Amino acid sequence: GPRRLSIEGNIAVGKSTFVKLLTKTYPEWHVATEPVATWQNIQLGNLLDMMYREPARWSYTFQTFSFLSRLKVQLEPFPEKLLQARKPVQIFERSVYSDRYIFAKNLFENGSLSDIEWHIYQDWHSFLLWEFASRITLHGFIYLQASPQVCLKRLYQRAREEEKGIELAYLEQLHGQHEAWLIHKTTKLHFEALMNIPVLVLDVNDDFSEEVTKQEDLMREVNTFVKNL
C-alpha cells in the first residue's frame, strides 16, 4: 500500500516551492494537487476573496467547500503509476485534518465562525471522517515550519490579490495552530488515528528556494523519513 503523507504549513511558507522540489526529486511519487485555482474561480465568483473580505460572512461556506474538496481527493483511487512501484508514495497538499485543526479551528477562535457554524462544521467533519475512516488514512505529515514574519515576508513577496490584506497577526494565529497540533500536541484531537502520526519537521526559515545546498539537504531528510514508514 502506498505511503500517504500531507504537507502542512503556514500561508506562503513555501509549500508550492517545496512540492516542485519533490516532483523533481522523486518522480514516481504522486502529488495530489491543492484546489487554490478552483477557489478563486468557482465556475463564477471568487470564494477565496469573499472569505477574506467578509470572514464573518463567508468563512463557514468556504470551509465547507475546502473540506469537501480535501475529502474528495483523499478518497480518490491510487493512479496506475503509483500502482507499479516498489515503494509508492502519495503526497497531499494539506489535509482533511488541517482543514479542521488549522483553519476552521482558528476561524472560530478569532470570531470568523459563529458557535452555530463551528458546531455544524465539526458535526460534519467528525461524521464523515468516521464513515470514511478506512479510506482517508495518512502515514505522516511533512511540516514546513517557519516564523510568521518570514511567512509574512514571502506572503507579500508574491502578489496574490486575495491575500494582500493579511496582517501579521493572522499568520501568527495560523502559526500557533500548527505549533499546537504538530509540535506541542496541545490541540484536542477527535480521531484515534490522528493521535500518533509521524511528523517530519523541516525548518525553512532560510529561503531554500534558491540555495541548492539546503534543497539537497531537505530532500535527504524527506527520503529518510518516508522510507522509515
Establish if 103 lies at the interface with ligand DTP (CB under 6 A). Answer: yes
Residue 14 marked ligand-binding: yes
17 versus 90: smaller Cβ distance to ligand DTP: 17
41 versus 224: smaller Cβ distance to ligand DTP: 41
> Strand locations in 68-220, DSSP E?
89-93, 140-145, 199-203
Helix axes 212-227, 15-25, angle to 10 degrees: 70
49 versus 179: smaller Cβ distance to a copy of itself: 49
Distance (Å, rounded) from C-alpha 223 to C-alpha 202? 12
Phi-psi region of 165 (alpha: psi -120 to 50; beta: other; left: phi over 0): left
Establish if 125 lies at the interface with ligand DTP (CB under 6 A). Answer: no
Minimum CB distance to a copy of itself, residue 73 (Å): 12
- Secondary structure of residue 184 in the 3-state scheme: coil
CB 4 within 8 A of CB 78: no
Establish if 15 lies at the interface with ligand DTP (CB under 6 A). Answer: yes
Residue 163 marked ligand-binding: yes
Residues making contact with a copy of itself (CB under 8 A): 42, 44-45, 47, 50, 57, 60-61, 64-65, 68, 72, 75, 114-117, 119-120, 123-124, 127-128, 131
Locate all alpha helices (DSSP H) within 11-147, ordered by sequence.
15-25, 47-53, 55-75, 80-83, 96-98, 105-109, 115-131
Phi-psi region of 96 (alpha: psi -120 to 50; beta: other; left: phi over 0): alpha
* AA identity, residue 74: Q
Query: Which stretch, 59-67, 77-85, 180-188, 194-202, contacts ligand DTP (CB under 6 A)?
Result: 59-67
Establish if 121 lies at the interface with ligand DTP (CB under 6 A). Answer: no
CB 11 within 8 A of CB 52: no
Helices (H) and strands (E) in the chain, counts: 10, 5
Distance (Å, rounded) from C-alpha 137 to C-alpha 3? 9
Establish if 99 lies at the interface with ligand DTP (CB under 6 A). Answer: yes
Minimum CB distance to ligand DTP, residue 180 (Å): 16
Establish if 117 lies at the interface with ligand DTP (CB under 6 A). Answer: no
Q: Which residues are catalytic, by number? A: 93
Query: Which stretch, 11-19, 75-83, 128-136, 212-220, contacts ligand DTP (CB under 6 A)?
Result: 11-19
Residue 53 marked ligand-binding: no
Residues in binding site = 9-17, 34, 52, 63, 70, 94, 99, 158-160, 163, 206-208
Q: Contact positions toward ligand DTP, by CB under 6 A? A: 11-12, 14-16, 34, 36, 48, 51, 62-63, 66, 93, 99, 103, 162-163
